[PDB]
Design a binder for this molecule. Structure first.
Ligand code: NDP
Ligand code: 8Q1
Ligand code: SF4
Ligand code: ZN
Lengths: 385, 51, 62, 149, 145, 332, 110, 157, 185
């Protein structure tokens, strides 16, 4: 069995993916992905920067679900700090996490389809994803990497003309999803290129740690935002799609239904949006209003000592876990009691999904491996931290 | 060659909250100025490990 | 203009006249867009320089 | 007195007293506190050799060291006097003493007030009573010392 | 004269060969107190220009002149001191004096008449470091008569 | 020549040295090694180029954020040449082509320009050092064409600046040399390796990094460098035949030769390819049949037994068998 | 295969060291064949280099430390043998008055 | 020279127009900047309008965009990719990680910019650069190409 | 199935001498064993009916350069059907072999290698233990508190030989460490 070197230097296979594998000529036996080409070194760099300076690390990891990533860090810091966040901040955080889920699902679906060969829905879905990156542009400073969510609440309040635009988008997003789905689900080629590909049993998914869509594509109803609801999700009404067969087609259907449920949750959060402040007030971990630190002494002191020293998290350690679009994303914070984290390991959902590729491509075609890569939605920012 | 010592309390402030901790002081005294922007350059990897 | 350095450009601005003993300087007309409020006790024969703004204040009469 | 030098990069920014109950007792003098400016002012950077015509140019380390090694033996084994400095550490003075003694000469002395003083008992030139021990005294008889300057 | 230091002050005006030397914030040497207490110095900052330690300079000059010395490192020269003054290598030790004014070369010689004279005139200009500073130059102009 | 090193820190790419050397004609073969050697020790190097703006592009990787700053200069113009030197203290000359174009004749290839830069450095009043480079074996009485003008330039430069070092490399060997790579390329095409010299032409090939080390060492050392003229040579003496075997054994091909006498090759080389006499300036460049080289291979290029040698500065030449010659694997 | 448990005593680690040296010598033609180096170096003094590097660390008595050096050496050997290490690095690692005056002339910090 | 100057100027103009009207950048995406780089080529900005069709292999592409951080392990691969390209080899350093260090700039396994390797012609700053910023960078590269007197230099020499 | 019930059950059901110490808090339930009864503890926690811990989330690692047992690897677990989390951790050492758990949870095969790479805690009966994250020619373990942030080697391209060669680190602007630590805390 001869060995050929994969590892294309372009994002047409997500880039940064060596993937040396064994070939019998047409059927692959063992595929060995060589991760580490994107080991930037965030985990070592976390310990050298305060709890505020370390927030933008989390946007870079899994750089398609930006606000779904810093949300886990914020929740971990809040748990370590016993900080209570106001209701409006919780609702807008849930809304923006759902927007991240929609963005990730769209990007994953179209990148996977373009890997298969269908290239026309790709540009349609990026046309629709323009409208949500514009929403990100509005609330925060930057389109993609938005440090909107902070440990206290969110960084800044929503602009006045935002909810109208969001609802106008949600009016037609369902029709756009239907248009994208009609080209793939009912198609013939899509079925023969996905059905009975990369089947994973529930026992295999549990053993290999496939929490996320891979776990739910095997019949396991394990949704972290329903099993362990963190923000205001009990109030919200949504369903958890669960597959029957562990093939790639049911994962695609599950992702489509997840986009539907995310749209439903966005509508619910838009309807049930309370007033009030956005940043917390119990502990002192939030900056004073810039119209307040310029005429008060204690407020200016707090601003100075927060933007230089930062808040000191009391010495403890914990493992938070949120439902990232990829799957379960968890941050293992260890606090020394000082203003810098002692150790912050990042549990990337894509790491386990990528290691579990070896048994998924067991006795498949070589071109049957790119579709397995696409269906598990691997970005290498999170895999190599 | 390293020096093991406990940093003393700073004179300017009366708090003793940074005391009782011991540090290893690698003598990384080799630093120069980049002749374009005045930045401080180093060639010793232990410039601030002990700090 | 850009030939004049800001140090030599602020000196030519005439000092403000204040009737009282202390004057509060907030930078710009809008308080939120200027420096933090600074109360300066102008009592000497020389103008009192605002440490943030550089503006000078002179007391004419009580 | 114990100090705490604070430096940013390659230059000393300020000098802060360090607590030492026996020697300085948390205080520090003005001369030792504001002398950090002299460490960056006019300083010797490279070896320099006077020229024949009176000019004073700079050379490499080997060249000046070669010149001094040329002139070291142009003089008699006697009269190779070497004067130590006020700030020179113990090692420098020790090596200077060894270098002078190993050439048939002995005229090494500390800078200033070292003409005919004998220092062999380690109490005729030292503060036998501890600096912290002066708090137990009852009378002082300062003899031409002025311990203020 | 072959001057070796880190400043000028009327010795450069007469020097024939000038060898730059390290300052006290950039060298590791043992200094002795008035009460016989010794303590070392930490190399805070790098040396300026092409300057070397004083002991390094004199050791290299000794080698080039052709006379051999049995030490080549800062540790070795410390062991040499241990045979001339072993208290100089005991950093944290409050050693007292084990003698007294009893034994001494008792010599009642001729007396004098000249009164005691001040040895320091300007407090802010004593050593080369304080003489070349700007803060001291303006400080010793309004703080004293 | 002292008081211009001004060392700052450890030997590194971002270190500092008091050298602002401008290497004229560094865009060729020797320049990409000399500039790298200069920048490795923190010296700032300026590369005045006259061709396209993309020719001194690979030289930006030598330094670190401003060590290498190329500028455009016009060889015909004079006062614009002063621009690329008004902030310099060291000047190195490498200009000179083995070819011959109409616009720049043999005299105005490595003599007139060298004299112009020497004179403008002399009148500059700040150029501390100068290292002009010529070929080994240049003389007034020689069948070689460019070597005669090159020798005239190397003797006329000293008049303007007496404290000028002259280096004489001999058939430099490297990854982009003009004497070994063309032979391999021709062998690949069809392959017969015409020996114009017909063997029995023993010279001293040298490897380029050794030459670059020689110049940087002449800059580093303080003493007998100004005025002195070195003659860099290889570890041993090589002829065109044994050099042919030591290049053929790596190409992994049968050594075949069409070794021919001198006059037929000279008649097929110089007059056949000499057509720069009318209308257009650019003409195709000679591959192996060079007008100067055919006349140059009639005499040995041994290093002078009484002049300066390559080991005078304590540099061991690279043994040109297994370590230097390794680029030929791209042909096999 | 799988990582063996740490050696109980030094005599059990000594045979492990000999086995590692044996494997390194067995695999030594492969490096010379796949990295295309024949004129620069002969295989015989590579034995000397490996022996020197394995005898320099011969004063360690702790069996765990010796086992860990064997482990790291195996990882380095597998990196070199496989197409992981890159050319001109194996050859980089493998194959007067006094020192004080030189160190004084070159720098202050030696 | 003036008689045969109009022809060479026209030839230079034609070559510059040909090279600016069809640039085929090679998508060497590495990190989050690759998202914005593929997002510029979407239906909203239409990077293809300027004849900026992408290429899958470095053999046909005449330009490459380094989008994303450049670790130590990918440096040799980047150098090999750059070497294989044909003679022109224009390089664009998209993002803030590629064009000099970046947000990390300090970790052990990061090359401090793609200028230690693969010499760069245009630096596009941003983290991540806006699609219009990448478009402006490409326009600046096109302006750079228009200054190449390819035939005039080879005819003067 | 909640924190307290699991605490009672694992206090009663678990054989002694396994858990060196244990904690119960809202942050998380801990079971600190003694670096030898790890495979046994995980096997019991995986197969028992009242504690059906099936999925191993991640294998952490904390470097404490102040205790005799320098390192401390942390095993995060999760019971899907009981909807509960157990965090088992040990104490390791820089020269010591701690047992592997790839047999129970196959997903650990890569976190095992990553923990070896970052810190240097080797493992037994593990098929590979090869570096997974750092460079092929990388030396030292970076997540140790000893390793400098900038590292030991730099990477650059030199023209004399057409390849990318490593070199000693030499930075243009040093990493400015701001010491914000203050007393009264
Ligand atoms: N190294 C060797 O193998 C040998 C070297 N030598 C001597 O060493 C010198 C350098 O060797 P080498 O590096 O091969 O030379 P180059 O191959 O570098 O050519 C010299 C460079 O100078 C520039 N140049 C040439 N003519 C002119 C001109 N008229 N006006 C302005 N710039 C010009 C060119 O740059 P562009 O093309 O970009 O204009 C050319 O690349 C040679 O000139 C020769 O005298 C002697 C024998 C053999
Ligand atoms: C190209 C190949 C690539 C890999 C090359 C190798 C790279 C790693 C090399 C390993 C580096 C090491 O230090 S790992 C090996 C280090 N371990 C030891 O040296 C054991 C301690 N020494 C002893 O036991 C004895 O003194 C002994 C000398 C053995 C004999 O003496 P006896 O008989 O009385 O016992
Ligand atoms: S510049 Fe910003 S977005 Fe681009 S790779 Fe670097 S960190 Fe990621
Ligand atoms: Zn004001």
């Amino acid at each position: 069995n001869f060995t050929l070197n994969f590892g294309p230097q372009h994002p047409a296979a997500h880039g940064v993916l060596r993937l040396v594998l064994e070939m019998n000529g047409e059927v692959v036996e063992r595929a060995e992905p060589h991760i580490g080409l994107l080991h930037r070194g965030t985990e070592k760099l976390i310990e050298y920067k305060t709890y505020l300076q370390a927030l933008p690390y989390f946007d870079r990891l899994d750089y398609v679900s930006m606000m779904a990533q810093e949300h886990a860090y914020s929740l971990a810091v809040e748990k370590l700090l016993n900080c209570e966040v106001p209701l409006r901040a919780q609702y807008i955080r849930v809304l923006f996490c759902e927007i991240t889920r929609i963005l990730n699902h769209l990007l994953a679906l179209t990148t996977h389809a373009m890997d298969v060969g269908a290239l026309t829905p790709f540009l349609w879905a990026f046309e629709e994803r323009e409208k949500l990156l514009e929403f990100y542009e509005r609330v925060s400073g930057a389109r993609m990497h938005a440090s909107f969510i902070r440990p206290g609440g969110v960084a800044q309040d929503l602009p006045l003309g935002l909810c109208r635009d969001i609802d106008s988008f949600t009016q037609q997003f369902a029709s756009r999803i239907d248009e994208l789905e009609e080209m793939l689900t009912g198609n013939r080629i899509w079925k023969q290129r996905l059905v009975d590909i990369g089947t994973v049993t529930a026992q295999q998914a549990k053993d290999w740690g496939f929490s996320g869509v891979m776990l739910r594509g095997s019949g396991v109803c394990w949704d972290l935002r329903r099993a362990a609801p963190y923000d205001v999700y009990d109030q919200l009404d949504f369903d958890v799609p669960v597959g029957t067969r562990g093939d790639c087609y049911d994962r695609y259907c599950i992702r489509i239904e997840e986009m539907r449920q995310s749209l439903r949750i966005i509508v619910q959060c838009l309807n049930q949006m309370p007033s009030g402040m956005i940043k917390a007030d119990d502990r002192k971990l939030c900056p004073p209003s810039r119209c307040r630190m310029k005429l008060s002494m204690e407020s200016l002191i707090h601003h100075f000592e927060l933007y230089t020293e930062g808040f000191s998290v009391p010495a403890s350690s914990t493992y938070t876990a949120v439902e990232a679009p990829k799957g379960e994303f968890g941050v293992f914070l260890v606090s020394n009691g000082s203003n810098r984290p002692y150790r912050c390991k990042i549990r990337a959902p894509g790491f386990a999904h990528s290691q579990g590729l070896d048994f998924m491509s067991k006795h498949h075609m070589l071109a049957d491996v790119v579709t397995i890569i696409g269906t598990q939605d691997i970005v290498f920012g999170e895999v190599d931290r | 060659k390293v020096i093991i010592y406990s940093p003393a309390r700073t004179a300017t402030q009366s708090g003793s909250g940074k005391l009782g901790k011991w540090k290893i002081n690698f003598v990384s005294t080799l630093k120069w100025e980049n002749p374009l922007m005045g930045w401080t350059s180093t060639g010793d990897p232990y410039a601030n490990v002990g700090d | 203009r850009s030939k004049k350095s800001p140090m030599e450009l602020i000196s030519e601005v005439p000092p403000i006249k204040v009737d009282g003993r202390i004057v509060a300087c907030e930078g710009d007309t809008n308080p939120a867009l200027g420096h933090p409020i600074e109360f300066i006790c102008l009592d000497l024969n020389e103008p009192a320089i605002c440490k943030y703004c550089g503006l000078r204040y002179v007391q004419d009469h009580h | 007195s114990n100090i705490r030098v604070d430096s940013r990069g390659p230059e000393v920014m300020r000098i802060i007293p360090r607590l030492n109950e026996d020697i300085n007792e948390e205080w520090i003098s003005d001369k030792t506190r504001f002398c950090y400016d002299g460490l960056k002012r006019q300083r010797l950077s490279d070896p320099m050799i006077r020229d024949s015509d009176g000019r004073f140019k700079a050379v490499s380390w080997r060249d000046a060291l070669a010149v001094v090694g040329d002139i070291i033996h142009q003089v008699k084994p006697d009269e190779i006097v070497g004067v130590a400095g006020q700030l020179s550490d113990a090692e420098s003075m020790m090596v200077l003493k060894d270098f002078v003694n190993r050439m048939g000469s002995d005229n090494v002395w500390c800078e200033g007030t070292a003409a005919g003083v004998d220092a062999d008992l380690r109490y005729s030139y030292l503060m036998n009573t501890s600096i912290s021990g002066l708090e137990n005294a009852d009378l002082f008889l300062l003899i031409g010392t002025q311990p203020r300057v | 004269v072959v001057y070796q230091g880190h400043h000028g002050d009327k010795a450069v005006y007469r020097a024939n060969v000038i060898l730059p030397a390290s300052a006290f914030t950039e060298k590791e040497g043992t200094y002795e107190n008035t009460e016989g207490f010794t303590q070392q110095t930490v190399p805070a900052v790098p040396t300026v220009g092409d300057a070397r330690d004083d002991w390094k300079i004199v050791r290299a000059l000794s080698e080039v002149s052709g006379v051999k010395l049995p030490y080549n490192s800062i540790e070795g020269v410390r062991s040499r001191i241990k045979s001339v003054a072993p208290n100089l290598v005991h950093t944290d030790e409050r050693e007292p004096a084990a003698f007294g004014p009893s034994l001494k070369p008792e010599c009642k010689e001729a007396m004098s008449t000249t009164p005691f004279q001040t040895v320091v005139e300007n407090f802010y200009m004593t050593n080369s470091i304080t003489r070349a500073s700007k803060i001291m130059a303006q400080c010793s102009a309004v703080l004293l008569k | 020549g002292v008081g211009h090193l001004a060392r700052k820190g450890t030997g590194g790419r971002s270190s500092v040295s008091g050298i602002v050397a401008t290497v004229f004609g560094a865009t060729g073969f020797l320049g990409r090694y000399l500039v790298q050697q200069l920048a490795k020790m923190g010296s700032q190097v300026l590369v005045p180029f006259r061709g396209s703006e993309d020719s001194p592009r690979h030289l930006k990787l030598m330094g670190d954020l401003g060590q290498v700053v190329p500028m455009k200069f016009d060889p015909r113009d004079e006062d614009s040449i002063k621009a690329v030197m008004a902030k310099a203290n060291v000047v190195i000359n490498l200009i000179g082509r083995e070819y011959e174009t109409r616009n720049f004749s043999f005299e105005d290839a490595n003599h007139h320009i060298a004299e112009k830069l020497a004179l403008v450095a002399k009148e500059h009043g700040g150029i501390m050092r100068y290292i002009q480079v010529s070929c080994l074996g240049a003389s007034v009485s020689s069948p070689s064409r460019m070597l005669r003008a090159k020798a005239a330039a190397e003797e006329a430069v000293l008049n303007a600046l007496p404290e000028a070092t002259i280096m004489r490399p001999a058939t430099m060997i490297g990854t982009e040399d003009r004497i070994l790579n063309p032979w391999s390329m021709f062998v690949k095409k069809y392959g017969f390796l015409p020996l114009i010299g017909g063997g029995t032409t023993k010279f001293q090939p040298v490897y380029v990094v050794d030459v670059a080390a020689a110049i940087v060492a002449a800059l580093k050392d303080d003493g007998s460098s100004m005025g002195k003229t070195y003659e860099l040579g290889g570890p041993d003496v090589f002829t065109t035949h044994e050099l042919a075997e030591i290049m053929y054994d790596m190409i992994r091909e049968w050594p075949r030769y069409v070794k021919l006498p001198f006059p037929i090759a000279k008649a097929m080389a110089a007059p056949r390819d000499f057509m720069v006499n009318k209308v257009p300036f650019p003409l195709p460049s000679p591959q192996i049949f060079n007008l100067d080289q055919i006349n140059a291979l009639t005499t040995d290029t041994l290093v002078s037994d009484n002049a300066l040698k390559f080991q005078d500065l304590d540099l061991v030449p690279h043994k040109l068998k297994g370590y230097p010659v390794e680029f030929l694997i791209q042909y096999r | 295969i799988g990582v063996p448990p740490n050696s109980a005593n030094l005599t059990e680690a000594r045979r492990r060291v000999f086995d590692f040296f044996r494997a390194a010598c067995r695999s030594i033609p492969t490096i010379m064949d796949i990295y295309n180096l024949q004129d620069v170096v002969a295989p015989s003094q590579l034995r000397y280099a490996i022996s020197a590097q394995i005898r320099n660390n011969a004063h360690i008595t702790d069996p765990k430390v010796i086992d860990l050096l064997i482990f790291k050496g195996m990882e380095e050997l597998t990196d070199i043998v496989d197409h992981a290490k890159q050319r001109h690095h194996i050859i980089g690692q493998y194959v007067g008055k006094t020192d004080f005056l030189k160190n004084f002339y070159t720098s202050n910090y030696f | 020279s003036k008689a045969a100057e109009f022809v060479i100027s026209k030839v230079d103009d034609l070559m510059n127009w040909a090279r600016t009207g069809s640039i085929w950048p090679m998508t060497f995406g590495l990190a989050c900047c690759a998202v914005e780089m593929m997002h510029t080529g979407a239906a909203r900005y239409d990077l293809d309008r300027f004849g900026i069709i992408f290429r899958p292999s470095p053999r046909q592409s005449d330009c490459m965009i380094v989008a994303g951080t450049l670790t130590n392990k990918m440096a040799p691969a980047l150098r090999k990719v750059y070497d294989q390209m044909p003679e022109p080899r224009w390089v664009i350093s998209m993002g803030s990680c590629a064009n000099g260090g970046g947000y990390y700039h300090y970790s052990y396994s990061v090359v401090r910019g793609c200028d230690r390797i693969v010499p760069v012609d245009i630096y596009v700053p941003g983290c991540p650069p806006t699609a219009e910023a990448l478009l402006y960078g490409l326009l600046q590269l096109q302006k750079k190409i228009n200054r190449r007197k390819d035939f005039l230099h080879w005819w003067n020499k | 199935m909640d924190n307290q019930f699991i605490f009672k059950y694992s206090w009663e059901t678990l054989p002694k001498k396994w858990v060196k110490k244990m904690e119960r808090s809202e942050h998380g339930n801990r079971f600190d064993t003694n670096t030898d009864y790890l495979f046994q503890l995980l096997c019991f926690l995986k197969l028992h009916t009242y504690t059906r811990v099936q999925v191993l989330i991640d294998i952490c690692g904390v470097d404490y350069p102040s205790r005799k047992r320098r390192f401390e690897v942390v095993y995060n677990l999760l019971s899907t059907r009981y909807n509960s989390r157990i965090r088992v951790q040990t104490s390791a050492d820089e020269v010591t072999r701690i047992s592997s758990v790839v047999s129970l949870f196959p997903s650990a095969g890569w976190w095992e290698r990553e923990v070896w790479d970052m810190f240097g805690v080797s493992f037994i009966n593990h098929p590979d233990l090869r570096r997974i994250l750092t460079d092929y020619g990388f030396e030292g373990h970076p997540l140790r508190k000893d390793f400098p942030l900038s590292g030991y080697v730099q990477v650059r391209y030199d023209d004399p030989e057409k390849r990318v060669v490593s070199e000693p680190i030499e930075m243009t602007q040093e990493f400015r460490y701001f010491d914000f630590a203050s007393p009264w805390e």
